Amino acid sequence: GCRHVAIIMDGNGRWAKKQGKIRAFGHKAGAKSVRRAVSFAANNGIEALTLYAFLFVWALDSEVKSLHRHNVRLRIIGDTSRFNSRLQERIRKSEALTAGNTGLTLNIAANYGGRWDIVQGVRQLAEKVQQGNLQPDQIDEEMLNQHVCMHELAPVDLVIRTGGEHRISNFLLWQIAYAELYFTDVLWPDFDEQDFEGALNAFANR
């Protein structure tokens, strides 16, 4: 069964323009598609769902109460150290609120890049070496792994990209070494529970 699904949610802009509407309308329909995918994963026993929008967190932090009632653990991945400190504190508070939740873990990428993610772990090892706490030839895959995002969760089983492009676009790199990759032309606001189940079958047929 699929334990950790990651989604590159692309197509909101193209959807709005096909509908003859401004870019803001596609965002609002995108956010409804987020709610539906989060609900569907939580009801189908997926352990972790990681969402990359291909700031906008301001929106979310009015849904945290609902997540928390639903037993969802919320985490933001990505470089938030330059966000304003009021947002950084609201991120911190939301993560602390839900940290003890034992249902679905929802990871929201916010200023995230796969290369950045690896580089941030390398910087950490680099400090250890400079402190004299670590030998260069003791650095292996297992050790680097312990310093990249999500290393405490089930490995990513399946990556879905909506919107028609066939690229990872510097979303997760280290983590997707063994993941099933599923590409669909459906635009993110139209991506629904049947589309999600479609992807879960491609994995079931691996």
Added chain:
Amino acid sequence: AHGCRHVAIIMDGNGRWAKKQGKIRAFGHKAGAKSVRRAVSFAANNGIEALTLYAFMELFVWALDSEVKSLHRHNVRLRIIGDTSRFNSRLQERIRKSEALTAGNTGLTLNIAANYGGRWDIVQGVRQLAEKVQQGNLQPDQIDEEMLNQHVCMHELAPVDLVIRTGGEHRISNFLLWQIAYAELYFTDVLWPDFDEQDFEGALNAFANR
């Protein structure tokens, strides 16, 4: 015109191809070698700068010798990527020689993965950087993406523009990781021994259109 400078291929389907024919596996590998020659000639004749091949055998790579002379005669530059350091001195020495012989060539650059993994590739780059930090040459905070980029396999070649995987599975299987952050990914159900010039044209024209 296709716009593609560096194509990487996960060559899968040799076992399935032989099974479909009622053959033992040594036959799929032989047909797979023929398809390698064909892809290499196709790339060299269609302006691609670099072609990087991942066989998804140890006796297969050893037999290369006849092959390296044919490469050289077609002005291909050969390089092996992967961890060759626990290979026998002897193999290691024929690798160096084969590289040295062809390193002046000006046509296609052909990279062959041998004991390669994406994760390993990143790890070896990180170790090069950690050595420099330990000898006091490098500060932890000067380490950025461009710098780690300069230490992974193939950094001196054009970025990988297109990854092709034959054989039907939709995964990277710990082939390139760092290097494919922006690459076009093209999956075909065609098995590797059947993948021919028109399938390769098809993948290039798909990259051009996308």
